[PDB]
Tab-separated table of N, CA, C and O and ligand atoms in Angstrom:
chain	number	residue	atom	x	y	z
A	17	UNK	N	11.621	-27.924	-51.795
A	17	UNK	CA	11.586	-28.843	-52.902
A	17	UNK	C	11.528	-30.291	-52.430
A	17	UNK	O	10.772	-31.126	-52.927
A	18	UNK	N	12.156	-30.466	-51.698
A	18	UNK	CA	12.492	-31.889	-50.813
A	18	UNK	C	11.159	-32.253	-50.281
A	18	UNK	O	10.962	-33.433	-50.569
A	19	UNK	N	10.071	-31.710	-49.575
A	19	UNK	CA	8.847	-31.846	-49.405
A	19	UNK	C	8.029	-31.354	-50.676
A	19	UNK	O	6.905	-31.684	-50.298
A	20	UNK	N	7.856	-30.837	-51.819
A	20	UNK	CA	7.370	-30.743	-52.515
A	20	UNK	C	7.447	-32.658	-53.628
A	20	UNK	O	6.615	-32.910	-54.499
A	21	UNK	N	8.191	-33.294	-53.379
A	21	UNK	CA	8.714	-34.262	-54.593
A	21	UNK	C	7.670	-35.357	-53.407
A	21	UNK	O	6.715	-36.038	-53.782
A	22	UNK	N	8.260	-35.250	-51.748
A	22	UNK	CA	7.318	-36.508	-51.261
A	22	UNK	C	5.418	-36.513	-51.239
A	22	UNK	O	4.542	-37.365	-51.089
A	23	UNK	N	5.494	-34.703	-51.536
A	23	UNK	CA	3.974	-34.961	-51.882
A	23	UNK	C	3.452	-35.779	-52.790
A	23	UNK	O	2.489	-36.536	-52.668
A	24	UNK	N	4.400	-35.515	-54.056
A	24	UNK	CA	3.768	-35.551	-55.633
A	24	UNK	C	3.814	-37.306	-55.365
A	24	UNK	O	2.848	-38.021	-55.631
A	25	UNK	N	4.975	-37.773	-54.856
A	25	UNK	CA	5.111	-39.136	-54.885
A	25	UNK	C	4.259	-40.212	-54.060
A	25	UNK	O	4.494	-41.414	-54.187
B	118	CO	CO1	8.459	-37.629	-46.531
């Protein structure tokens, strides 16, 4: 999740 949020961001 933690690498999923710095993708989106
Ligand atoms: Co990052």
């Amino acid at each position: 999740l933690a690498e999923a949020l710095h993708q989106a961001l």
